[PDB]
Amino acid sequence: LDAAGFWQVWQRFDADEKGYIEEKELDAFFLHMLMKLGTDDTVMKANLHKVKQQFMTTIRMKELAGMFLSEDENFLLLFRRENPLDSSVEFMQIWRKYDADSSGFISAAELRNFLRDLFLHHKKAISEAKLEEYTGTMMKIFDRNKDGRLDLNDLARILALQENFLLQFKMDACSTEERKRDFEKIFAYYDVSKTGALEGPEVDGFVKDMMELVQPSISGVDLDKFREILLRHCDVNKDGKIQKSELALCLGLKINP
Template sequence: MAEGQKGKTFLDKYPVFFSMSSHQFAEIWQHFDADGSGHIEGNELDNLFRELLHKLGSTDISQEEVNFTREAFLSTYDFTGDGKIDVYELATIIMPPDENFLFAFHRRHPLDSSVEFMRLWRKYDVDCSGYISTEELKNFLKDLMEQAQKQVTAEELEGYTTTMLELFDKNKDGNLELQEMARLLALRENFLLQLKDSAKSPEERKSDFEKVFAYYDESKTGSLEGVEVDAFVKDLMDLIKPNLTMQQIEDYKEAILKHVDKNKDNKLQKKELAMCLGVRL
């Protein structure tokens, strides 16, 4: 247990959880997500629940008590079932409902499509700078609040924007890179992971490919275009080199289209997509 003077723990700085501000929540998150992975996991989970037990008055806390508490909390709050706690799950545990509305909104509207993610990215990266600036993030949060029918003051909006940057701006430059924004939106697992098993038969790979094409062809036009191509290239390159910037994605997209886009329409037909993935149709 990380203890300070007189046996106090980090959480003892916060007398009452459910009256804390979003800024205080950000401090707690950054403390327990020690490696900055975007999840509290492994030993970080043990540290969190050991300190929670200490805050609730327990002394001489055994590993068995920590394990029991961890499993009890995960069974209730681990919505994704991955054995970890993400920022939204921790917020559900310790933040008051009024401060927690963004997280609650996220849970009602989960972002499980990388195409939708790229659509949002293109919408809010207004100046096409390759990152979401503080002002662009503020506009995004303002729109979320309006969709959730929640009225907030300009001061509250500033506070939420600051908190989101504290939580997700890993390099602390006042902007959100592509992967930082993906973490804010809790974008789900890369859909292309379905094709990574090289032991699959040609028939199984063809079946997987059809699912992949249907996933990215949200417009059902029979080809990938616009943000659909963006999403595919992002997911494809994430398999090879994670955490790329938007500019790097643009560079890879240009190279891929130059290689497979035979009719030069800046779209990916089904045969062209199959060529990218090494699948014979």
């Protein structure tokens, strides 16, 4: 049993990643899973029993992953699930890092590099053969249109990227103090390097979050396209960065910082 096979089984019950299944799905889950391991009708009721028991003696994905997968394949499915990426800026630093040819998509070879570094980071030596196998499994799990490359949103799901930070802000918070508070929250979030201007991946993350307020999840090529457009709109000094004072004026902030 590999992560992809477990994932395909998990799909029947949790297609949109609640992260769990329900207690009367459980038996049908073991059934279907046990069916997947190629199990005989003669051994079914016992294996089901033993399995149910082990679990009872121990419904979220981590629990079913530990039973049916190796520690390296659990890692693949849960390395971020326990530690989701909180910042879209950090996300785009990773994206830029691994989209080394700037094609706007993560190819199989770039995914392999991502995973090599990932395993080294968690101080885990895996063979070259498993590196290849895992790249293939990850691709299969996360390549939605099976076209052989990973899109922006696909890496986002691999990294368990949290909700768009911008979605917390509301139309009716319209007072000057409300808008100033929210503007400061926003700029603190994107200006990770605390330079007073959004640069490189800080722009990226802001562009992604802004465009996804009004469009379905955007592609890597569209990001670069919208980044240019946003800069042509708001980059008053034309230095390739968004100074706070430029973002503030472009968002209608009453008092320019």
